Write a protein that binds this ligand. Structure first.
Ligand SMILES: [Mg+2]
Ligand SMILES: [Mg+2]
Ligand SMILES: [Mg+2]
Ligand SMILES: [Mg+2]
Ligand SMILES: [Mg+2]
Ligand SMILES: [Mg+2]
Ligand SMILES: [Mg+2]
Ligand SMILES: [Mg+2]
Ligand SMILES: [Mg+2]
Ligand SMILES: [Mg+2]
Ligand SMILES: [Mg+2]
Ligand SMILES: [Mg+2]
Ligand SMILES: [Mg+2]
Ligand SMILES: [Mg+2]
Ligand SMILES: [Mg+2]
Ligand SMILES: [Mg+2]
Ligand SMILES: [Mg+2]
Ligand SMILES: [Mg+2]
Ligand SMILES: [Mg+2]
Ligand SMILES: [Mg+2]
Ligand SMILES: [Mg+2]
Ligand SMILES: [Mg+2]
Ligand SMILES: [Mg+2]
Ligand SMILES: [Mg+2]
Ligand SMILES: [Mg+2]
Ligand SMILES: [Mg+2]
Ligand SMILES: [Mg+2]
Ligand SMILES: [Mg+2]
Ligand SMILES: [Mg+2]
Ligand SMILES: [Mg+2]
Ligand SMILES: [Mg+2]
Ligand SMILES: [Mg+2]
Ligand SMILES: [Mg+2]
Ligand SMILES: [Mg+2]
Ligand SMILES: [Mg+2]
Lengths: 116, 70, 155
RNA sequence: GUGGGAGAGGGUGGUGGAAUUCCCGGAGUAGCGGUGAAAUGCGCAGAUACCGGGAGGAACGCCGAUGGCGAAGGCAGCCACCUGGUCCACCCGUGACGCUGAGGCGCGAAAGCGUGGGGAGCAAACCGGAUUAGAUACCCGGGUAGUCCACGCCCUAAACGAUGCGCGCUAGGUCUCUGGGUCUCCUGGGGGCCGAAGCUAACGCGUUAAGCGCGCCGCCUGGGGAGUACGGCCGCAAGGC
């Protein structure tokens, strides 16, 4: 009910999960998916296969919205951070460009004990 | 690979307003290039870093950028 | 095989066909060192399989063994706690061995009274695309395509 | 003295972007988070993810080094102001004005104390979830003091180069920071690495001495008891000498 025909795709990948949000050229989201949206529940959500399935599910929902041309934004690092982009390439969506916009601070906040 | 100073003129390392030449010393991202790729001495690099930060605060040089093709 | 490659034994050819797979299958049928009785089993089964269906037992044997050979399987790999079932492809030599073993084991798990009858009907069913050996093969293949989520643990 | 130089040296005020959190709004469904697995937890009062806007605190990515500065503790965005130390060249001035230093005085990471502010993130205590034979721990989710600032205390440390300060003498080689020079190089002054002689119980040190000498200060005399007791002094207390 939108007929967007073009937009962005943000891939947020971590070591516990990978999620894909397909949005429009001025930032508002259209659809999304993740390792928990699909069957997997626990650490299974962090596998590259779950990332591939999440990317494919989000891409098919975008097809339902009528998406053809997609720009890719990538934030984070984890298993399947690349598999998501590979499935997104071979999903049937013409990939416009891939961009890694992983937010990194300028040494602002103190991390948790795990991260020091 | 070519170092920045090797392909450049007799330019001012203390000019924070010349974006044309200061852009050469930034990376694909907004990061300052190391001495391995700038071919500068320690003193030259130390002056270049401060001039780059000066230009950044004046909105002439990017504080950070986005990586492509990743 | 810590040092060497464990060079494969080259079986003797067969006296009836001249083919090596027949000798390998006859060995797989043999028990307690009776290759004579096993050969008689296989060749009475050859006569029965050539009579009950008017085809050559050569190509039916070959097509059955070809139908039973699987293309993927699972091996257990110890990673981060308890091990996982990781799928992978199969060697041609191991495909041959597994096909013949499943053939014999599904033939002797049949109801038929005589051994040769079991062998013949098992070969027939396997050559048609059905039977117990092909069922075990397709279960092996169903292990693949199922735990394929571990496709990054190939090793 | 003159003339140049390098620097996260200190203080004060200003100021920039990234990121976290929170709030407002848009769009958008069903989970997010987390782990070796999980669960507590959060989510239909609309979360997570995405976009725009706002608020606030704290810390300064790349440059960055095996680098620099400081007497030590220690000191990293940028700008301005106030200010310390230091190095080199000139061979100009004073004319032994020097070295060390019991006491004293000042400084002194973190944590801690008092009064008043501040509070994002982190986080003793604590509240829960797991794990385990038990879990008072490691792992997960929360969370106070605190961490931050002003002022006044506290005087400890693996406060380490486990090497007190100063001066002279005793092969070089190699990397480096910063000056001067007639600038394959030389000559000072710092930071490393090999290694002469020599030293050392050995490891190792070796012009940045643990070598050869001189001056002065501090300290040592088997281990436990014990940095405890008593006494004194200091401290709001903790406690310190
Ligand atoms: Mg997870
Ligand atoms: Mg400074
Ligand atoms: Mg300062
Ligand atoms: Mg909202
Ligand atoms: Mg709820
Ligand atoms: Mg609930
Ligand atoms: Mg509720
Ligand atoms: Mg607030
Ligand atoms: Mg660094
Ligand atoms: Mg000064
Ligand atoms: Mg004179
Ligand atoms: Mg005179
Ligand atoms: Mg003195
Ligand atoms: Mg004294
Ligand atoms: Mg103190
Ligand atoms: Mg403190
Ligand atoms: Mg306080
Ligand atoms: Mg926390
Ligand atoms: Mg905690
Ligand atoms: Mg318990
Ligand atoms: Mg001495
Ligand atoms: Mg020079
Ligand atoms: Mg020094
Ligand atoms: Mg030197
Ligand atoms: Mg010697
Ligand atoms: Mg040495
Ligand atoms: Mg000496
Ligand atoms: Mg000694
Ligand atoms: Mg003593
Ligand atoms: Mg004693
Ligand atoms: Mg004590
Ligand atoms: Mg006494
Ligand atoms: Mg006392
Ligand atoms: Mg008292
Ligand atoms: Mg004590």
């Amino acid at each position: 009910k939108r007929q967007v025909a073009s937009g962005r795709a943000y891939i947020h990948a971590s070591y516990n999960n990978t999620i894909v949000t397909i949005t429009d050229p001025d930032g508002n989201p259209i659809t999304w998916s993740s390792g928990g949206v699909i069957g997997y529940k626990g650490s299974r959500k962090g596998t590259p296969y779950a990332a591939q399935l999440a990317a494919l599910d989000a891409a098919k929902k975008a097809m339902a919205y009528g998406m053809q041309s997609v720009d890719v934004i990538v934030r984070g690092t984890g298993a399947g951070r690349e598999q998501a982009i590979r499935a997104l390439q071979a999903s049937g969506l013409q990939v416009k460009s891939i961009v890694d916009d992983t937010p990194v601070p300028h040494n602002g906040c103190r991390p948790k004990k795990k991260f020091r | 690979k070519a170092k920045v100073k090797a392909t450049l003129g007799e330019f001012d390392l203390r000019d924070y307003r010349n974006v044309e030449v200061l852009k050469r010393f930034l990376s694909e991202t907004g990061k300052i290039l190391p001495r391995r790729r700038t071919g500068l001495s320690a003193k030259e690099q130390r002056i270049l870093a401060k001039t780059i930060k000066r230009a950044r605060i004046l909105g002439l040089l990017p504080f950070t950028e986005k990586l492509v093709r990743k | 095989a810590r040092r060497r490659r464990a060079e494969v034994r080259q079986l003797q050819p067969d006296l009836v066909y001249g083919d090596v797979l027949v000798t390998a299958f006859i060995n797989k049928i043999m028990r307690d060192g009776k290759k004579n009785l096993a050969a008689r089993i296989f060749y009475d089964a050859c006569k029965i399989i050539q009579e009950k269906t008017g085809q050559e037992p050569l190509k039916v044997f070959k097509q059955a063994v070809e139908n039973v050979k699987p293309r993927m399987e699972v091996r257990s790999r110890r990673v981060g706690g308890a091990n996982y079932q990781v799928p992978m492809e199969v060697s041609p030599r191991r495909q041959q061995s597994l096909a013949l073993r499943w053939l014999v084991q599904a033939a002797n798990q049949r109801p038929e009274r005589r051994a040769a009858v079991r062998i013949a009907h098992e070969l027939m069913d396997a050559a048609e695309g059905k039977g117990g050996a092909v069922k075990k093969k397709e279960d092996v293949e169903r292990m693949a395509e199922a735990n394929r989520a571990y496709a990054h643990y190939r090793w």
